[PDB]
Design a protein around this ligand. Sequence first.
Ligand SMILES: CC(C)[C@H](O)[C@@H](O)C(=O)NP(=O)(O)O[C@@H]1C[C@H](O)[C@H](n2cnc3c(NP(=O)(O)O[C@@H]4[C@@H](O)[C@H](O)[C@@H](CO)O[C@H]4O)ncnc32)O1
Length: 491
Amino acid sequence: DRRALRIGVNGLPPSLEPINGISNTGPRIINQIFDALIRRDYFADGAKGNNIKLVPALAESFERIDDKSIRFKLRQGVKFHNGAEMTAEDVAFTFSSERLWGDEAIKTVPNGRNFSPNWDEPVVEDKYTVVLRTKTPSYLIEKYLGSWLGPIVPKEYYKSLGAVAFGNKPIGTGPYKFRELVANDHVTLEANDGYWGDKPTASTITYQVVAEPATRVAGLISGEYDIITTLTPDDMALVDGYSDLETRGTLIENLHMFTFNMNQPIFQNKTLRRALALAVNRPLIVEALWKNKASIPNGFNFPHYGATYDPKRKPMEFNLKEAKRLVKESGYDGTPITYHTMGNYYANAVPALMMMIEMWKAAGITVVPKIFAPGTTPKDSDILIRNWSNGQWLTDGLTTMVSEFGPGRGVQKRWGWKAPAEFNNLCDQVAQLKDGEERSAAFNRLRDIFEDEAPAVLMYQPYDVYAARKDVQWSPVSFETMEFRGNLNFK
Ligand SMILES: CC(C)[C@H](O)[C@@H](O)C(=O)NP(=O)(O)O[C@@H]1C[C@H](O)[C@H](n2cnc3c(NP(=O)(O)O[C@@H]4[C@@H](O)[C@H](O)[C@@H](CO)O[C@H]4O)ncnc32)O1
């Protein structure tokens, strides 16, 4: 009786395990399978899918005890998709040393510690009461638990499988349950009619990989999909000529960027990294490819950071003359530098690259495109420049400056960035510091080092564009996810 929803996607995540699936492609599936203790109510008070309001979800209520602990009273009678009841034991397990942040845990959940605050072990007080806490003060615990770090996993089932196998056969409490997957092809979910919240409106949801955006557009037109993802503003004219189809877009809390393998000699030092940054004329790219709908941040700095947004910070400059001076200072010898991109996995990746190649040529640098196919993982040692994105996943400036670029984390450890000591000291400091003038100035000091060092170059916040049949009522949200709770009606 309920319609089956068909979504043509840019790709599938490497896992459906909540943390290992953090990516542009995972939340749209993981949000359906799981619930967290707290949900972001994107559409509260008439907001156009960008409200930050956090409301109770698997937690019926909660109260902060002190600067490092929160007591959660859980909703009773919630079931996981395998029939097991959700209790404090599952919530404690979700945020335990064993699963998330301990030495052994991070062998199978590699960013469990990197992305977490300084957790202490959860304390189970009764079947429906758990205290979540940090070893040191943290004013962000609530925000973490309402984020993509927050999905609650089933303790016994997850332990029986381990994180890798669980990521191929996930069980949660959410409105849709996992049915099947074929790697790099599709994921099918089915309605969980035993859902504790509003009943699911779709009988099944299928996420089908269609890597090429032109093919994905053609598939919505030809009636193969109900919704398609990862389009650009210029794709609106291909869709909108048809009366029964439309585009739906919004600025999302994500940053497109490019970054460097700083283990490679040409990028061991900051000079050429910063020259490449200064040579990009972002306004021109945004005009040409984005209809002026993408937003160029004034540093690693967004309005949804709230108290750590600095509206007075100056934008990063486009300065060709200075880029040229830094190319000469760097001793650049004319070697062609590759830029790897997995096609248009990121919207406008290839057109933006081709515009940037011309800007880099104007600075005296030869950059060559290396477009690779889905499922052809380039070796780290073969990467010079690559594109990437970072979801700005708390309403706080700590992410992703600290969570990606901080001490011991991926950019420094895997990709070789030799950050100044003071950068790493500031990263550690801001995690214990309450919002206020001092925290805002510390983030500006981090941003200054980040700009000087250029371990990555921020391009813009994309204007995310989906296309859909008008007979499917669904609004996008300002994040790299799809929300169907209270937001998916057919006809
Ligand atoms: C599991 C392994 C055993 C296996 O060998 C293989 O899967 C593998 O090679 N894994 P490896 O780690 O080497 O990941 C490879 C190496 C390379 O960095 C690439 N990559 C990483 N992030 C990706 C990205 N993120 P995204 O832009 O969609 O999502 C970002 C996310 O990366 C980021 O953490 C988050 C918060 O900043 O924001 C998201 O938007 N989008 C497309 N490609 C991505 O895949």
